[PDB]
Amino acid sequence: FDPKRYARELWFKLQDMMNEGLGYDAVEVLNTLDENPELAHQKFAKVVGVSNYRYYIIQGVGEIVEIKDDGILVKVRENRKVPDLFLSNHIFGNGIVNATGIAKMEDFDRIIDFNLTATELNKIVKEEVVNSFLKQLSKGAGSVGSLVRFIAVFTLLKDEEIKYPIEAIPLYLEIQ
Numbered sequence: 001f002d003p004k005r006y007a008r009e010l011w012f013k014l015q016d017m018m019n020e021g022l023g024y025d026a027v028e029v030l031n032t033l034d035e036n037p038e039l040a041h042q043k044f045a046k047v048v049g050v051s052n053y054r055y056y057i058i059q060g061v062g063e064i065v066e067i068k069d070d071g072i073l074v075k076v077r078e079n080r081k082v083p084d085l086f087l088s089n090h091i092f093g094n095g096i097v098n099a100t101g102i103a104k105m106e107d108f109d110r111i112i113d114f115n116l117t118a119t120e121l122n123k124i125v126k127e128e129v130v131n132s133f134l135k136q137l138s139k140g141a142g143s144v145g146s147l148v149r150f151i152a153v154f155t156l157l158k159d160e161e162i163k164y165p166i167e168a169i170p171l172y173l174e175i176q
């Protein structure tokens with residue numbers, strides 16, 4: 001079993017899905033989280049198995065507030081104390097596959113095949129979405145104040161207080 005190839009194939013499938021329309025409106029989701037997180041989980045999040053984690057996928061346009069070594073802080077709403085989103089390269093675990101539904105455990109004969117595939121796909125996104133975008137920012141593609149179209153995933157624990165900035169893994173990032 002080749003998890004590197006499998007991941008690359010999932011990524012192509014995910015790219016097609018994002019071209020077709022993927023993610024809830026970022027402002028609506030965050031406003032609902034601020035008002036009523038359980039309603040937000042119900043309306044906007046996926047559950048995998050029977051766990052207490054809630055997997056979100058959002059899309060929108062944000063303004064770059066700060067550029068860091070490991071991501072960008074982005075504002076999607078006005079009048080907030082801190083940026084709404086930290087779009088970072090800190091990609092670990094099953095958040096991408098669980099938020100997107102691109103792969104599930106039942107697709108694999110072994111648990112280790114699922115785990116290695118999730119690792120390979122996180123590598124693709126780290127390198128070819130996030131780190132790639134940070135490099136093109138350094139080369140003049142944008143700066144603080146630029147607008148960025150994004151699709152991003154994040155995971156909440158049921159009953160955890162929402163704290164901003166929400167750290168989210170970007171699946172799509174482009175200057176607008």
Ligand SMILES: [Cl-]
Nearest residue numbers: 018019020172
């Ligand atoms: Cl798109």
Ligand SMILES: [Cl-]
Nearest residue numbers: 110111112113
């Ligand atoms: Cl296993």
